[PDB]
Write a protein that binds this DNA or RNA. Structure first.
Ligand SMILES: *P(=O)(O)OC[C@H]1O[C@H](n2cnc3c(=O)[nH]c(N)nc32)[C@@H](OC)[C@@H]1OP(=O)(O)OC[C@H]1O[C@@H](n2ccc(=O)[nH]c2=O)[C@H](O)[C@@H]1O
Ligand SMILES: Nc1nc2c(ncn2[C@@H]2O[C@@H](COP(=O)(O)OP(=O)(O)CP(=O)(O)O)[C@@H](O)[C@@H]2O)c(=O)[nH]1
Ligand SMILES: Nc1nc2c(ncn2[C@@H]2O[C@H](COP(=O)(O)OP(=O)(O)CP(=O)(O)O)[C@@H](O)[C@@H]2O)c(=O)[nH]1
Ligand SMILES: Nc1nc2c(ncn2[C@@H]2O[C@H](COP(=O)(O)O)[C@@H](O)[C@H]2O)c(=O)[nH]1
Ligand SMILES: Nc1nc2c(ncn2[C@@H]2O[C@H](COP(=O)(O)O)[C@@H](O)[C@H]2O)c(=O)[nH]1
Ligand SMILES: Nc1nc2c(ncn2[C@@H]2O[C@H](COP(=O)(O)O)[C@@H](O)[C@H]2O)c(=O)[nH]1
Ligand SMILES: Nc1nc2c(ncn2[C@@H]2O[C@H](COP(=O)(O)O)[C@@H](O)[C@H]2O)c(=O)[nH]1
Ligand SMILES: Nc1nc2c(ncn2[C@@H]2O[C@H](COP(=O)(O)O)[C@@H](O)[C@H]2O)c(=O)[nH]1
Ligand SMILES: Nc1nc2c(ncn2[C@@H]2O[C@H](COP(=O)(O)O)[C@@H](O)[C@H]2O)c(=O)[nH]1
Ligand SMILES: Nc1nc2c(ncn2[C@@H]2O[C@H](COP(=O)(O)O)[C@@H](O)[C@H]2O)c(=O)[nH]1
Ligand SMILES: Nc1nc2c(ncn2[C@@H]2O[C@H](COP(=O)(O)O)[C@@H](O)[C@H]2O)c(=O)[nH]1
Ligand SMILES: Nc1ncnc2c1ncn2[C@@H]1O[C@H](COP(=O)(O)O)[C@@H](O)[C@H]1O
Ligand SMILES: Nc1ncnc2c1ncn2[C@@H]1O[C@H](COP(=O)(O)O)[C@@H](O)[C@H]1O
Ligand SMILES: Nc1ncnc2c1ncn2[C@@H]1O[C@H](COP(=O)(O)O)[C@@H](O)[C@H]1O
Ligand SMILES: Nc1ncnc2c1ncn2[C@@H]1O[C@H](COP(=O)(O)O)[C@@H](O)[C@H]1O
Ligand SMILES: Nc1ncnc2c1ncn2[C@@H]1O[C@H](COP(=O)(O)O)[C@@H](O)[C@H]1O
Ligand SMILES: Nc1ncnc2c1ncn2[C@@H]1O[C@H](COP(=O)(O)O)[C@@H](O)[C@H]1O
Ligand SMILES: Nc1ncnc2c1ncn2[C@@H]1O[C@H](COP(=O)(O)O)[C@@H](O)[C@H]1O
Ligand SMILES: Nc1ncnc2c1ncn2[C@@H]1O[C@H](COP(=O)(O)O)[C@@H](O)[C@H]1O
Ligand SMILES: Nc1ncnc2c1ncn2[C@@H]1O[C@H](COP(=O)(O)O)[C@@H](O)[C@H]1O
Ligand SMILES: Nc1ncnc2c1ncn2[C@@H]1O[C@H](COP(=O)(O)O)[C@@H](O)[C@H]1O
Ligand SMILES: Nc1ccn([C@@H]2O[C@H](COP(=O)(O)O)[C@@H](O)[C@H]2O)c(=O)n1
Ligand SMILES: Nc1ccn([C@@H]2O[C@H](COP(=O)(O)O)[C@@H](O)[C@H]2O)c(=O)n1
Ligand SMILES: O=c1ccn([C@@H]2O[C@H](COP(=O)(O)O)[C@@H](O)[C@H]2O)c(=O)[nH]1
Ligand SMILES: O=c1ccn([C@@H]2O[C@H](COP(=O)(O)O)[C@@H](O)[C@H]2O)c(=O)[nH]1
Ligand SMILES: O=c1ccn([C@@H]2O[C@H](COP(=O)(O)O)[C@@H](O)[C@H]2O)c(=O)[nH]1
Ligand SMILES: [Mg+2]
Ligand SMILES: [Mg+2]
Ligand SMILES: [Mg+2]
Ligand SMILES: [Mg+2]
Ligand SMILES: [Mg+2]
Length: 311
RNA sequence: GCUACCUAAGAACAGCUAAAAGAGCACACCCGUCUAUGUAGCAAAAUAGUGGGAAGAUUUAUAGGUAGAGGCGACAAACCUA
RNA sequence: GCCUGUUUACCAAAAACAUCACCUCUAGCAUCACCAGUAUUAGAGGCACCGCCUGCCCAGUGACACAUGUUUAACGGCCGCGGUACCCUAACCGUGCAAAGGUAGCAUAAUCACUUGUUCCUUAAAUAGGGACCUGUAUGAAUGGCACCACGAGGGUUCAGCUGUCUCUUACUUUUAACCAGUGAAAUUGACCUGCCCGUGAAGAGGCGGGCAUAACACAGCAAGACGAGAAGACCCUAUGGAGCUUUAAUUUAUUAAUGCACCUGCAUUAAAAAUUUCGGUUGGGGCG
RNA sequence: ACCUCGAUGUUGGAUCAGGACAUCCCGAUGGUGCAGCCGCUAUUAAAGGUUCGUUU
């Protein structure tokens, strides 16, 4: 740990493919079949960047927030997470975990009276509550369909689940979720943003895996773990990957893990005499494997919002 | 007499790494992933390269068996003389 | 998707089918499959190796009720210190002192008498109970979901190299080519002495109208037109034209399987297997009359 | 529902582009709330030109 991040004109990365451009006009074509809107985010990013569009555009149905990924999260400061959301205007938040289905039972109260607290306009006679989940990629929207299908319908899996952003393609059909009070979920492709706030807020959202690692950079994401595992005093990468004691240079930490994993690469280096090939430790493969252990949870439960928690 | 499966009694499977592996590399063999040529063609489905398997749920010679309201089928509602 | 395998000979090799393992169903048995077998077997299937946990459709009173824990109980070694002994070897006395203790009530698995159920009489409404008696009151289950260790001519993504893929093509060689010689097809083809522009027209003209152009013929290229050639468009519709398949469509039960007034045979009932025949007209995309 | 169901093949792309001008640039002018620079608009002009990538 030396100081903060020298971004030095890093510039925001931007990924807006045909998923979110086409999805938005198929999401906005279907607000007559929606009784509630579910916001699903990472618990690593509750406050800093949620979404530019989704907050103020969608106001007709009331909001409920589902901050998923609570197993890789420390909630000693749960009291003030509510504080920044209460001051925003966001009232109810349900933190969920989706391997033991922890606190996933508790939402099934908290949707039923919420539609009852408000008006329904057209669907005054319908007993079937068709509700919609929307959000940025890779946060827990498709697993929320399958966890809620598991513990209430006791039926099974209805949506493809496996960790890489963008392998669900478009707006699919309805999915039965429960028999006790009836409720249908609509699955959406993850609309992230046309523009992503600032540069620092861009990397906080890019770190959880919601964007491909190519447009941002594997070693660019690699140094930002060293910002958040050394300045937070959460030195939790030194019992799995303990190199000598602890380091803050991205050059040194990608060195020693490549020895421990046995990584080799053959790179055309460009010296002044000509093009020669030198065998090097595989710095992208070291930047890959250092990022996967972060997402598995074998590096420590971290908050990414300590920079905005200061004050 | 093709083909699908079966019966009878037969045959084939180098070298290499490993040891009793429906193991790995790889011939002979079997199959046909991709490309190109070919499209009245060499061929009513082939050639050249690249590929999958190649001691096994393998491949194959010979003789027999099941026949159409049927046979046979590791279901492609495939195959039963184009 | 577990894997090796398997499949549409001739447009699909796959994520499909198969696969151990697991689960459900049927069968207590001989001489022609199963099988010269016998429930750890055989058949019919489902799912896909192994791995992980979710509680249960015995209705009552009251008592049985476990360590673990709680209901709650005494005394002394090494050594330290103050003294009395005294060349010394070092002693003696008076003390301080850790752990060590597990009677025994009690939420609390062990298993059962009791309006409690059967049956039968009064009302001839159930007056609302009298009885007669007693039901070893059969082990209290057993099904869904998750899950990457390898593997893959599977579907995506990526690091690095690499190379005419590309920027931007070039050179050469062979085949082809063109020409000379020999042999010699095929689709195609109303007749054509077969131009361009604008207009026209069955709505896109070589042929019609008004202009324009125009000696005649070979050879090599080109692919804009001849709605170019090949195959009575696979999409849409029609036919009281077919066929495959499925049923809770109609008509049937001869046929097999059961019983009826040992098998056979003759008439009935309930099923299984099927057989035969059709699927009006008017809006078809409807946001589902 | 007019031509074609005795076959008029389906978007973009590659290649080659022919044309219109209702002009995006270059050229020539009128007006400006046109100081200069940038512009805005109109007239005139089709000779020439109109890039390379990321994303299924
Ligand atoms: P990649 O090379 O990006 O894929 C190319 C795509 O071509 C498609 N396509 C061919 N012909 C089409 C057509 O007549 N009409 C459409 N709408 N698309 C056509 C196309 O879609 C089928 C391809 O990409 P994908 O299949 O991956 O889907 C993206 C596709 O979605 C459409 N879209 C995106 C965003 C938005 O705001 N509106 C849209 O309509 C685009 O067509 C886009 O290509
Ligand atoms: N180590 C670990 N992994 C988890 C945990 N929970 C979820 N995962 C992982 O994340 C899951 C993937 O989530 P998924 O909904 O498929 O994300 P996605 O990549 O955006 C897929 P799609 O594009 O279809 O929406 C699984 O791959 C895997 O179980 C956890 O508690 N621990
Ligand atoms: N560690 C952990 N991760 C979880 C848990 N639950 C959900 N996740 C994660 O949530 C992520 C999935 O988000 P996802 O539902 O796929 O977002 P999406 O919008 O559908 C992606 P797309 O853009 O394609 O639409 C995954 O990285 C992973 O499953 C959990 O209990 N633990
Ligand atoms: N429209 C449509 N949806 C399907 C089809 N198959 C699956 N789905 C959707 O995917 C969901 C999950 O199906 P799985 O077979 O469990 C279904 O509930 C339905 O929403 C299909 O053939 N058509
Ligand atoms: N797996 C699967 N997905 C389908 C199928 N048909 C449609 N889909 C899903 O629905 C999408 C198209 O939805 P709509 O036709 O807009 C597809 O891109 C795919 O995600 C199908 O047959 N199989
Ligand atoms: N019917 C049908 N066949 C297809 C389609 N796409 C591919 N195929 C078949 O698969 C073959 C191989 O295609 P792969 O995508 O390489 C094709 O030659 C064709 O036979 C499709 O959309 N429809
Ligand atoms: N016209 C046309 N040509 C096509 C189509 N699909 C492929 N092509 C190819 O493009 C070429 C260009 O022909 P023109 O479009 O007539 C054709 O010769 C053919 O090879 C299509 O749908 N229409
Ligand atoms: N119009 C058109 N779209 C095409 C064509 N080939 C592919 N596509 C588009 O690409 C998509 C992907 O199909 P692939 O050919 O598997 C199609 O669904 C279609 O949208 C083509 O020849 N014409
Ligand atoms: N009127 C006209 N505008 C043109 C012409 N050529 C180019 N343009 C203009 O230039 C633009 C170029 O577009 P880019 O390729 O994005 C066109 O959209 C059009 O506005 C032309 O011949 N006439
Ligand atoms: N017309 C005009 N503009 C000037 C002159 N000097 C400076 N400027 C303006 O000042 C600008 C640069 O000066 P400053 O350093 O910003 C120029 O681009 C121009 O706009 C001058 O003499 N005449
Ligand atoms: N080559 C190229 N890059 C572009 C284009 N548009 C955007 N980009 C890239 O995306 C970046 C972000 O552009 P946004 O318009 O802010 C650009 O700085 C450039 O790198 C384009 O038309 N061509
Ligand atoms: N339209 C389709 N899209 C995707 N898979 C298909 C498909 N039609 C067939 N298949 C695949 O082929 C398998 C076998 O189908 P077949 O028509 O019996 C299916 O189980 C499925 O895996
Ligand atoms: N001096 C030179 N150097 C390189 N290439 C040359 C050359 N002289 C001729 N060429 C080649 O010859 C081509 C032109 O000759 P020819 O017409 O093909 C060029 O495009 C180039 O590829
Ligand atoms: N230096 C060069 N490199 C490559 N090709 C060449 C060349 N000089 C000549 N040529 C080839 O020879 C042809 C005739 O050229 P010459 O000088 O007339 C060229 O068109 C090209 O194909
Ligand atoms: N312009 C032309 N016209 C006619 N025949 C030609 C021709 N050019 C070549 N040929 C033919 O090709 C033959 C070989 O020609 P190349 O130039 O060698 C000639 O003798 C002649 O038969
Ligand atoms: N007018 C025409 N006459 C003859 N053959 C033609 C033709 N137009 C096209 N073709 C044939 O079809 C091929 C592809 O052309 P596309 O469909 O335009 C051509 O290379 C040619 O073989
Ligand atoms: N909705 C439907 N209407 C008519 N026939 C149907 C049908 N669904 C299925 N079938 C018939 O039953 C067969 C088996 O279908 P099942 O869904 O497995 C089909 O091949 C078809 O012949
Ligand atoms: N409309 C229909 N007409 C006839 N048979 C049908 C049918 N719909 C379904 N079936 C039959 O029922 C089976 C299962 O369909 P069910 O709706 O789950 C099909 O495979 C087919 O045999
Ligand atoms: N090479 C070129 N040839 C022709 N017009 C061009 C061009 N480059 C640009 N342009 C035109 O000029 C306009 C202004 O470009 P400038 O660099 O601001 C562009 O929007 C385009 O219309
Ligand atoms: N080829 C071209 N033809 C016409 N105008 C051009 C041109 N290239 C450039 N220009 C003009 O010059 C301006 C700047 O040129 P570039 O930055 O060199 C463009 O905005 C455009 O107006
Ligand atoms: N470098 C360039 N050269 C030529 N045309 C360009 C260009 N950059 C942009 N254009 C074209 O100019 C038009 C608009 O750009 P302009 O500078 O506002 C578009 O048609 C665009 O494709
Ligand atoms: N020297 C010139 C300039 C313009 N003009 C006329 O000016 C107009 C077009 O301007 P040019 O493109 O500059 C036309 O009317 C043209 O006849 C001319 O006749 N002689
Ligand atoms: N340095 C200068 C000189 C003149 N100009 C312009 O030229 C006009 C005439 O200037 P002369 O010095 O007279 C000025 O009114 C101004 O519009 C300018 O912009 N900058
Ligand atoms: O019988 C057939 C039909 C198509 N084909 C060809 O197979 C190809 C099918 O398309 P795919 O996408 O490769 C296409 O080239 C067809 O002309 C055959 O070779 N045989
Ligand atoms: O060759 C093709 C393929 C698709 N398509 C169009 O694309 C649509 C989707 O086809 P894809 O291949 O999924 C199809 O319905 C057509 O409209 C074509 O027009 N031509
Ligand atoms: O010598 C020249 C002439 C013109 N050009 C380009 O052509 C454009 C048009 O010029 P003209 O002469 O109208 C000019 O603006 C330049 O972009 C050159 O690059 N060089
Ligand atoms: Mg099938
Ligand atoms: Mg009639
Ligand atoms: Mg009608
Ligand atoms: Mg037609
Ligand atoms: Mg014709």
């Amino acid at each position: 740990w030396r100081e903060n991040f020298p971004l030095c004109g890093r510039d925001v990365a931007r990924w807006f493919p045909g998923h979110m451009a086409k999805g938005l006009k198929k999401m906005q074509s279907s607000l007559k079949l929606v009784d509630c809107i579910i916001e699903v985010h990472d618990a690593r990013i509750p406050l800093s960047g949620r979404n530019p569009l989704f907050q103020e555009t969608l106001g007709l149905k009331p909001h409920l927030l589902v901050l998923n990924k609570m197993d890789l999260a420390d909630l000693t400061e749960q009291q003030k997470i509510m504080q920044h959301l209460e001051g925003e205007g966001l009232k109810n938040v349900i933190f969920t975990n989706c391997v033991k289905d922890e606190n996933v039972k508790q939402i099934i109260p908290m949707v039923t009276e919420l539609i009852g607290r408000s008006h329904r306009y057209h669907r005054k006679e319908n007993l079937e509550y068709c509700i919609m989940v929307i959000g940025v990629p890779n946060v827990g929207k498709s697993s929320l369909i399958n966890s809620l299908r598991r513990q209430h319908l006791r039926k099974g899996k209805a949506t493809r689940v496996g960790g890489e952003p963008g392998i669900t393609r478009a707006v699919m059909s309805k999915i039965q979720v429960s028999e006790r009070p009836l409720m249908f979920l609509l699955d959406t492709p993850g609309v992230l943003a046309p523009r992503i706030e600032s540069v620092e807020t861009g990397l906080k959202l890019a770190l959880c895996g919601t964007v491909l690692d190519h447009l941002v950079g594997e070693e660019t994401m690699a140094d930002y773990l060293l910002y958040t595992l050394n300045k937070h005093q959460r030195f939790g990468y030194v019992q799995h990957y303990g190199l000598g004691s602890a380091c803050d240079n991205v050059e040194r930490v990608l060195k020693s893990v490549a020895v421990k994993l046995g990584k080799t690469q053959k790179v055309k280096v460009l010296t002044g005499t000509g093009n020669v090939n030198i065998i090097q430790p595989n710095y992208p493969a070291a930047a890959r494997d250092f990022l996967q252990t972060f997402r598995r949870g074998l590096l420590g439960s971290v908050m990414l919002d300590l920079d905005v928690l200061r004050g």
